[PDB]
Structure 1
Amino acid sequence: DGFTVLSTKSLFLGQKLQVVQADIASIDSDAVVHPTNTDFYIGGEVGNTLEKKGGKEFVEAVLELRKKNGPLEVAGAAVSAGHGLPAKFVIHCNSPVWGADKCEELLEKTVKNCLALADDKKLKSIAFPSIGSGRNGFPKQTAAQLILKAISSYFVSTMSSSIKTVYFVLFDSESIGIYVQEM
């Protein structure tokens, strides 16, 4: 595949939130978001697609980041170069596990931290997948509404802010099916 725009929303200053159907690895935004864990394990669904696309270049960048950063703190966001990928940078986030205490709040928090990091690097665009709803077990709709809520909230409260466009990237048929059905 593949690229379809499914929904577009105006954020607080008219910045655009686009929900799109695509493989996130194929998106050429300034940043793409990789949901990972404290050890930067590259074995979630999105991690596997980034590794498929970027190969060794991608993996060694993640390793170098783990060595420089140390373990990724709860809800933490960190950035590596997008070697092997269309995206300029990869923002790595410590994705909460469904069922862990305060897991919804932490999902919101991690999203905002990814946005702050992109802003700190003066990035114009950032692509999020449905963080938490793969290997970490969130229900797809719950994950998606938390992420979209957290992006909107960021832009209401952030004065500015270099981000022009936010992509919310859906790939699995269940997520797409529920997004479209329930909207």
Structure 2
Amino acid sequence: ASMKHNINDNTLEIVVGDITKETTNVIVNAANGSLLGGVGVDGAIHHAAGPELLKACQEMRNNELNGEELPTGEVIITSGFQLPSRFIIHTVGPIWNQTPDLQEELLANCYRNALELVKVKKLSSISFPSISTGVYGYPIHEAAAIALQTIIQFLQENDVGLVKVVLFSERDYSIYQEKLKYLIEK
């Protein structure tokens, strides 16, 4: 299952798939602030990338983040190592309902900051997972709306290239498909 849409010279695609098997130059990891290994998409990414990824992320923690956590909504970039994709942009989504009045803004920041980095570094293509909707508990209907709104607005105003949202389930995909149809019509 897949749906594609042109936004100026950019393309947005939603697809069912495994983000560790993508053809985009960049994939996004829904990471934790400590840049340590976890479960879910982060776990799959570390497994597929191999053990150099954790080592590189810890070097980034200690050398660029002065030994501290990556803040919610912010991004760093590493190699993809054994992944097919060449780079991983790691971001930290909000933990649902910890900070309800800021969480929509912070989730949007994950998308905007990743896309800005792709734009400025001319990285051409990028896949996102469904950030915050696993261990971090964010309802998929609300998250999908924020993700798509943020991505679409960015692609209306900026030259980026190809953006995919890669969903691990038909259910998550079907929710994205409904929202995208609504935003494309509206």
Q: TM-score, normalised by structure 1?
A: 0.87
- Structural mapping, 1:163-182, within 5 Å: 163-180=160-177
Q: Which position in structure 2 is the counterpart of 1:136? A: 136
Distance 2:167 2:5 in 1: 16
Alpha-carbon distance, 1:140 to partner: 1.3
Task: Tell me the percent identity.
Answer: 29
Counterpart of 1:43 in structure 2 is: 38
Contact 2:13 2:164 in 1 (8 A): yes
Return 5+ residue gaps in structure 1 as ranges: none
Give the superposed CA RMSD. 1.7
Distance 1:178 1:114 in 2: 22
Contact 2:16/2:170, CA 8 A, preserved across alignment: no
1:89 counterpart residue number? 87
Q: Residue 121 of structure 1 corresponds to which residue in structure 2?
A: 121
Runs of 4+ residues over 6 Å off in structure 1? none
Instruction: Tell me if structure 1 keeps the 8 A contact 2:31–2:93.
Output: yes
* Aligned-residue offset at 1:7: 1.0
Alpha-carbon separation, structure 2, partners of 1:126 and 1:44 = 22
Contact persistence 1:35–1:44 (CA under 8 A): no
Structure-2 separation of matches of 1:76 and 1:180: 27
For 2:9 and 2:56, locate their aligned partners in 1 and report how far apart those are by CA, in whole Å: 34
> Cα offset for 1:125?
0.2
Map 1:1-183 onto structure 2 (within 5 A).
4=1, 6-11=2-7, 13-70=8-65, 71-101=69-99, 102-158=102-158, 161=159, 163-180=160-177
Number of corresponding residues: 175
* TM-score normalised over the length of structure 2: 0.86
